[PDB]
Symmetry: D2
Subunit: 378 residues, 4 copies
């Protein structure tokens, strides 16, 4: 019923009987007295925790979904979902997914899962990939990182469901403020809440948001058995960051747009990548599925060695991760995509001098000035 910004503040904000705490108290207890529960629901912290459930309820509400489950990290959420793929079955994804996701694909392949990478940006590429026998899961990360191409969630989902397959979107990049995979036709939204959801670079976490009750049971059973559960204090921090998610994302987007214009005016910048550009190859898909184009920007630096440029920022921080209040810069070839061969990177279109920006909430003019200073050198 409540709109999105209200859901961020009040979703899962369960009342405290007797005392009336507006902010729910933090449930750190690992164990529970059984005899004084009218309807015994709480037994042991790995299985049940009120603070964790409140965060879950909040996240589910952001997508008007019945279910969410949180995890110790984004990788743990992914690993859980992927554990449901059985020997002989096939997962179709794209060869530009997050390295952590690809690492889990590798493990799945050890366990008799056929991993099929595909181009999911053309009708022919989609058609080919989705014809795989025993197709169990289609894995969409959109926008992709660091080239920021997109995949038509609704179209891939329609075609995947004709094959009986489950569709997950890793929605970490966009956050539910900007993109709603379940509304688009997908079955699962996957997040690293470590990024923009928690938003303050001070907690690790993951989440799955979905509607299927059978999936829910399998996911909860796996979390309980594998024990990849987040702590109560961590859930408190994720929940606390969540209040400002909409305000932060919109600030980040507005600034990214400013930085994109700076970049397009620089003599030492080549190609600029941003989902919001009108010449973006999938601009129509961007317009149809994203309420705004996001806070990640990438560009080809032409002024010399990228590693020298990285040392010149005095406001952007050089490091990995994204979505936080502090603006970050990295060079994928030297950092996030370093474990790949130079050949694989060239094949992926990731040039040695491609630079990636994760825009924080600092003043846009300070960020633009820092960027311009770095680019000009001297």
């Amino acid at each position: 019923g409540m709109r999105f910004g209200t859901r961020l503040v009040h979703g899962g904000r369960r009342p405290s009987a007797g005392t009336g705490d507006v902010v729910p108290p933090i449930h750190v207890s690992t164990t529970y007295e059984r005899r004084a529960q009218d309807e015994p629901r709480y037994f042991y912290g790995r299985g049940e925790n009120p603070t964790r459930e409140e965060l879950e309820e909040c996240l589910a509400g952001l997508e008007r979904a019945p279910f969410a489950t949180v995890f110790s990290s984004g990788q743990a959420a992914a690993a859980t979902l992927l554990s449901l793929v059985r020997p002989g079955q096939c997962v179709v994804s794209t060869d530009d997914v997050y390295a952590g996701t690809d690492g889990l694909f590798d493990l799945a392949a050890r366990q008799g899962v056929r991993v099929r990478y595909a181009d999911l940006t053309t009708p022919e590429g989609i058609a080919a990939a989705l014809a795989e026998p025993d197709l169990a899961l289609v894995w969409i990360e959109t926008p992709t990182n660091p080239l920021l191409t997109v995949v038509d969630v609704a179209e891939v989902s329609r075609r995947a469901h004709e094959r009986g397959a489950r569709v997950v979107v890793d929605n970490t990049f966009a956050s539910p403020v900007l993109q709603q995979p379940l509304a688009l036709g997908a079955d699962v939204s996957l997040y690293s809440t470590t990024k923009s959801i928690a938003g303050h670079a001070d907690v690790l976490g993951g989440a799955l948001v979905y509607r299927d009750a059978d999936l829910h049971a399998a996911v909860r059973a796996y979390r309980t058995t594998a024990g990849n559960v987040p702590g109560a204090l961590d859930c408190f921090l994720v929940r606390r960051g969540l209040h400002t998610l909409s305000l932060r994302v919109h600030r980040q987007v507005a600034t990214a747009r400013v930085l994109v214009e700076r970049l397009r005016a620089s003599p030492v910048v080549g190609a600029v990548h941003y989902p919001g550009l009108p010449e973006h190859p999938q601009h129509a898909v961007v317009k149809a599925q994203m309420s705004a184009p996001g806070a990640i920007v990438s560009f080809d630096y032409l002024g010399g060695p990228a590693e020298r440029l990285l040392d010149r920022f005095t406001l952007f921080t050089c490091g990995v991760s994204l979505g936080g209040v502090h603006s970050l810069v990295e060079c994928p070839a030297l950092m996030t995509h370093r474990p790949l061969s130079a050949e694989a990177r060239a094949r992926r279109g990731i040039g040695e001098s491609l630079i990636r920006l994760s825009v924080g909430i600092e003043d846009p003019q300070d960020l633009a000035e820092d960027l311009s200073r770095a680019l000009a050198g001297g």
Copy 2:
């Protein structure tokens, strides 16, 4: 370098040598090894703490000031500043200050401090009040609560300084995002950080921000001896909330303006108080010293008992405090100003049907709809 929104994120964000943490680690240690420091700076947690210091550096930076000191609560910040006034000396304040401030005034009065209240909104009231002998401190809270009247900080500061007095502004209401007391000529900005600065209703804290080094030494000596220091985990929470202060405040103000228009349109609303209204009795001062008119709104409800109105809200929370992400509603006569007598409230213009809103960051249309449903109800 650093404009305001940048200072919120990076003010006091000291590098971690060796490990390189972007978010500085939380220093919970009460105790320090003497032999492990090049120069002996850290001795004991009550006196020194890096996490507390980082918060202070951030706060000072928001007003481009050399000094800040944080406290276990806003009351503690106020108590510290007040402790500097000697018996036989006089504090001049507005009649409508925070009850906690008045509680501190009463406490000081029993030590021999003279407390004089005055109308600081008129040139005659200012001239009268500042003519009190032994004037040591002029205490300005603006806008006031719950009537949202406004005092000209620059003007009162110019006159107070001619009398050699220190000027403090309780700037909790506006936050440094909207009002800069030191730039307006005051000597000290006082904050309850419990409110908008931390902003998530999950930690108590206070702060003083100022420029005078002698004041700095006196303030720190008192905090150390009185022991009204905040914990490191609390400073961490305040600092974390600070990141989004400007985004929060601007959302809150934009929604407050929306709610003000809903109130004005309602046939069961009498007076509406908001510093942004053209007919606000101090509109010119508001325009001169506040960058936006804030997120507190108050109004007289005409449609029946205040209690019945309060029962009808389903999004606004009925409680005290303000500045947080959750929207709050209160009836001063029944809640915050309940200690005063009925006669005292009348004298102060706080009527039984005066309602106060503290606007949060929820969707403006959800908040507007909740308010309208409440106004239109009748049981």
Copy 3:
């Protein structure tokens, strides 16, 4: 450093500049590259100094070169099991923790062969270790809730002749009472949720070991599976760890008092405790455990177990163990309820078997609560 000193100072990394005695809590998920001489901190899932300090402390308690912590005991166990290939064999006992058995089932659905055996007799051991492609021998000792014991040194000897890794789930005893690595095992496994953190306010797991290749594999899996604990959680475990020896010794001393109370009760039948002189593996307990632990179980004779549970006013009725608060449960109604009555009888878990987890309350208060509850 001796044991008690290692609890306080293990992993207590100096704060250069400031001199913090208690190391500051590193909550940052991300790291500036240019601020490190030679960069070793990149991202919180991979690296975190607070987590590393806890790991260094834990490793120190067993004089071992390595430790890795996890979001839970289950996650530590899952990590170790992930190194067993389909077709290969894990040998364990049928009375292993239900969570461990849940993980065995998960592994078995990937094609891991799980064989259960009697590891308390030479013939049972010989038959178990005869399994081809034996990769891992999983020892939980003492067992719960009957408190039987497996000879770690003897089983490890035989297992190593077959080239197998040996892990001991040492949660029950803690490293204060039992040192699996010194006894010959390859890995100590812990739910730090229990006695290690000790205050029932944080979930966590740990593996402690000496093999460098194992180390690389365990870390690679934790990074990829993402089953990492939070920094604030590591702080709570580390903080609880300071008093582990003091807590355990209080708990054992009280457990011993409660055992004699139970043996004197006309409404109590069999009493189980690793320290009783007629315990069937008494020789092994003595050679293997410096003290017999803080868990007690007994057969209640005085009426329905639910009514017994309803009569405690100091013991708390709930699961978990090892904490400062004393807990009581009835396995048939609680921990082992998901079993059939037939399976429980075969395991020797009677309908009126009661289990106590002794906390650090005054022993006289606990003894009086117990007697009052028993109503003998």
Copy 4:
């Protein structure tokens, strides 16, 4: 319940509905008024359940009806002192904590009469309590760093004839070892920063008392001066409290061992410890303290204190006390540095007087570190 049980369960309020054994941490500053059966919780500075639970625990350790906790020990002290009116007189000892003297100085500038006395002699007492408008008698026992002791029961008797309130700053001993209220005092004052929280990771203070009028004044002051602790801090103090008794007894046991080491060292002169038979007030120690504490001091004869301080590799050289980590300091160089050398001379604080605060490390490790330092 008995003492060790009170540490674990004192203030351990039921979580209705959910059943949390460890109570959840109440961080909310504000409360919904319509959701309360009868409005008790309005605002965090005035009311907070986590804080109240800690207060309930602390009161219970002295079988007292009231306790109030503060942001620090100084804040508790400041609160109690605010109740003394200008023109009234506080009597204290010449050697109280420097923070207490700072508060005395603040009070003296408000017009309070401060009088220092020897509360060790019957003459020093009778002279002190003859002060005209005597409102408060301030006892710190044992004293720091010479560890002299004042008879609480005797001073309290005489002070009560004069109608004065009596407080004991009982930080040194903790409620495990000394019960000021049972001894006849009106208030127990604590820095909970020290042994009560016990892990050197939180600041706090507490007052424990029985008088309802005092209770109202104390709460009105705290609410107005706003010297309130945070919820997370109260959680940490409360969590540390569980093990207070176990820790204190470990510390005392080790202190006795260190005292024996000191007595046999040729570079040690006088040794101060309340448990020594030669202690000038040993009878009073025996009557007032269940054990003689965890603090030891001694004269180092081997040269300047720096020579000794630099050699410790286990003891940490820093201020504070009562924590799990053993600490060493030289009062003249550190805690009592602001004093002139003349003032220290008069107080009997020598330039090479050393003070040990014994933690919970293994006693033989601590003894060895001390001997190594002494030997060079």
